[PDB]
């Protein structure tokens, strides 16, 4: 006869009906990803709409239970994720204009083709087309053509659509009692109802720009070493005083610097660590990569994989009779069915990925006891952090020598640990200002902090200040450069790639001090130690039922988001990077430009 009695009764109707619709919306979505066919594209749209319409009838029923009268914090976490109207607060014209834009904004990004209208040979696809020319080319104009003429049509036919996308999603969040839409994406990190652990949506901006004041002395030395090594490749294009040009960072936007490792090696005469020539000679197949990735998680205390994991998941490209989008995604279908979908090959980059996409499944298997609305990570960048601490442990030469892959007499010296860290600094440290600046840009375009005339002037003013990247030729306001990225056009949150970095070293320093390691953090390993994986499983099993400040205190002991483990990881590199930068110019100047003539 009380509201908290009817709330648990309603959620028992929800959890025993949404679980039977989320499985049929995921199994039908699995049948499309394995079979790209004209029949299976509608079965993920007919059965996918049965759950898209189910969450609208329950969101109109759950709002009859007020959240001021319930005192159980478990029910208030499931009802807060259910009473949110989302895009239902708009009219019929605005909700139809939003779905028309989102089905078209993702279309011009994917189906935007680049050709030279004067030469017949200069036409290519995107992957493995335009991604190849922007990664492994050693010319300046061959990269400039793939960078300016890529945003000459995709960065121009996405400007008036994203301009209307700002005013459409601001009314979606102003009627949901949020401030802006930028305050709606910081509502995942919000914690209310717990005393002492209250995390506001506005304290995420106070924490992200406070974590960047410690990672900036590290990035300024990584940038000054990459720029000084680009002088030997382009001696007549880059000045060694100012900033870097945009199309020389590795790919189309400059997010990851992974492809810049092949030109800026610290020591080239040293043998690079690799198991690709030790997996083909030992005759490894698509099963042995996951049979050796399973023994990593059993050795720390996490359970074995299910029997339905090995008969239903797709690991090998199934010939030419069927086409499958086999980008690596770990599939949690619900109802105890856990699969995985990737095109595996015998290489180290797919051996560390098999550790990365099985660490997602060992997270989805851990919160299976939770109710349906609490079966997710503690925040958005919390699921991708526990999946990548396994990639940081399966790449060390203590694990590659333990499974017989690496040589038994492979010498580890001072000059080997740097060459592994600079491969990791371009992928982890180098993407940190690029992840923070784009989310600094979206949170300042949704707050109304810019007018229309400085829409593209205040984006390159931030690339020349945060990431230290200039433009080769200037872009006017008719251009729109950030919409060329996947997460801006398809409207994904991008701060989940900034907090997974700061959490994956808070976790690894917590899982190496539990495994009793004596030495630097990058040579550490968590396998063959049950007292470290049982530390993590007390956090993996919580799901969303606990706030993320108490899930960090379960493994680390600090409710905040800290930097000091990440500076302790790259401390043997940052010591070397200071000693290599006595003659260079640590820091950049905004006044330089390649077209400043």
């Amino acid at each position: 006869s009380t509201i908290e009695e009817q709330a648990k009764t309603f959620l028992d109707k929800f959890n025993h009906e949404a679980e039977d619709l989320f499985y049929q919306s995921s199994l039908a979505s699995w049948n499309y990803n394995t079979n790209i066919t004209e029949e299976n594209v509608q079965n993920m749209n007919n059965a996918g709409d049965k759950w898209s319409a189910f969450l609208k009838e329950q969101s109109t029923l759950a709002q009859m239970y007020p959240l001021q009268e319930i005192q159980n914090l478990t029910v208030k976490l499931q009802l807060q994720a259910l009473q949110q109207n989302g895009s239902s607060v708009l009219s019929e014209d605005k909700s139809k204009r939003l779905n028309t834009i989102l089905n078209t904004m993702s279309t011009i990004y994917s189906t935007g083709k680049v050709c030279n209208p004067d030469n017949p040979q200069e036409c290519l696809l995107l992957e493995p087309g335009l991604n190849e020319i922007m990664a492994n080319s050693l010319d300046y104009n061959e990269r400039l053509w793939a960078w300016e003429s890529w945003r000459s049509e995709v960065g121009k036919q996405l400007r008036p659509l994203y301009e209307e996308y700002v005013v459409l999603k601001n009314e979606m969040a102003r009627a949901n009692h949020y401030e802006d839409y930028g305050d709606y994406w910081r509502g995942d990190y919000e914690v209310n109802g717990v005393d002492g652990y209250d995390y506001s949506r506005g304290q995420l901006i106070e924490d992200v720009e406070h974590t960047f004041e410690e990672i900036k002395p590290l990035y300024e030395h990584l940038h000054a070493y990459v720029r000084a090594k680009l002088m030997n490749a382009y001696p007549s294009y880059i000045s060694p005083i100012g900033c870097l040009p945009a199309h020389l960072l590795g790919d189309m936007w400059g997010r990851f610097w992974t492809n810049l490792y092949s030109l800026t090696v610290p020591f080239g005469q040293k043998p690079n660590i690799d198991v690709t020539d030790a997996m083909v000679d030992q005759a490894w197949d698509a099963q042995r990569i996951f049979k050796e990735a399973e023994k990593f998680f059993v050795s720390v205390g996490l359970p074995n994989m299910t029997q339905g994991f090995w008969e239903n998941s797709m690991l090998t490209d199934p010939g030419n009779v069927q086409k499958a989008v086999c980008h690596p995604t770990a599939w949690d279908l619900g109802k105890g069915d856990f699969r995985i979908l990737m095109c595996t090959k015998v290489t180290m980059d797919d051996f560390l990925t098999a550790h990365h996409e099985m660490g997602h499944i060992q997270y989805d298997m851990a919160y299976a006891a939770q109710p349906f609305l609490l079966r997710n990570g503690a925040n958005e960048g919390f699921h991708e952090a526990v999946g990548e601490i396994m990639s940081l442990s399966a790449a060390t030469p203590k694990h590659l020598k333990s499974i017989g892959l690496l040589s038994p007499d492979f010498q580890e010296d001072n000059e080997t640990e740097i060459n592994f860290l600079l491969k990791q600094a371009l992928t982890i440290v180098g993407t940190l200002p690029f992840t923070y600046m784009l989310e600094k840009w979206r949170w300042m375009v949704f707050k109304g902090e810019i007018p229309k005339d400085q829409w593209m002037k205040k984006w390159w003013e931030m690339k020349r200040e945060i990431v230290g990247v200039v433009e080769p030729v200037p872009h006017d306001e008719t251009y729109c450069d950030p919409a060329s990225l996947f997460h801006v056009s398809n409207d994904y949150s991008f701060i989940r790639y900034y907090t997974r970095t700061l959490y994956q070293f808070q976790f690894q320093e917590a899982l190496c001090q539990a495994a009793k390691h004596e030495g630097p953090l990058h040579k550490c390993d968590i396998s063959n130690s049950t007292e470290a994986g049982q530390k993590l499983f007390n956090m993996l099993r919580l799901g969303k039922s606990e706030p993320w400040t108490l899930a960090l205190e379960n493994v680390v002991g600090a409710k905040n988001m800290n930097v000091r483990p990440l500076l302790n990881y790259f401390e043997p590199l940052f010591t070397w990077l200071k000693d290599q930068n006595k003659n260079s110019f640590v820091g950049w100047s905004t006044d330089w430009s390649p077209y400043a003539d």
Binding site: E5, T306, G336
Partner: protein, 194 residues
């Protein structure tokens, strides 16, 4: 002399659901329980009160065999002194139970592609069950004080929710057929022993 018809309780082609579990009064036959240990196909064989060795030395008056189909992680609720959505609303065993509980996987007979929605269970009951009480009822569960005259609406839910049995489910969601033998001694003559 005849054998006990255990070939109609264990090898039945279509079992029952746990809200409307069947019950077969097995009496006046020479029951052979020694081929039940040696079958090696039952995932759970727990005997409460009696022993697997004492089951061929003692004779019981009535042997009731209750058969139903439940989930994977709800087999543990079929035990004397458990609670949940099965041991309180569907099939409650008494605290002084004196029988054996069979349980085995039946994914290749009770699961079809797309869903086998023939097995149901009580999700909402206005009280708890007495031990060994079965009540088939389709009454709309009044979860408030509105009231509701049959129309399933706001805070008046249908109690019989169906099982989503599929062949690609997990171990804890696959259908486990369960037979519960409930031995007892009464004040009648007894002739059920091996």
């Amino acid at each position: 002399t005849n054998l006990c018809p255990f070939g109609e309780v264990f090898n039945a082609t279509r079992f029952a659901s746990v809200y409307a579990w069947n019950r077969k009064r097995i009496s006046n036959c020479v029951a052979d329980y020694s081929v039940l240990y040696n079958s090696a196909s039952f995932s759970t064989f727990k005997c409460y009160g009696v022993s697997p060795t004492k089951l061929n030395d003692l004779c019981f008056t009535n042997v009731y065999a209750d058969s139903f189909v439940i989930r994977g992680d709800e087999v543990r609720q079929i035990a004397p002194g458990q609670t949940g959505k099965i041991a309180d609303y569907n099939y409650k065993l008494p605290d002084d139970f004196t029988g054996c509980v069979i349980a085995w996987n039946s994914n290749n007979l009770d699961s079809k592609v797309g869903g086998n929605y023939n097995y149901r269970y009580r999700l909402f009951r206005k009280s708890n069950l007495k031990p060994f009480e079965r009540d088939i009822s389709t009454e709309i569960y009044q979860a408030g004080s509105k009231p509701c005259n049959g129309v399933e609406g706001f805070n008046c839910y249908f109690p019989l929710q169906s099982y989503g049995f599929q062949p690609t489910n997990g171990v804890g969601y696959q259908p486990y057929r369960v037979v519960v033998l409930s031995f007892e001694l009464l004040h009648a003559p007894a002739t059920v022993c091996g």
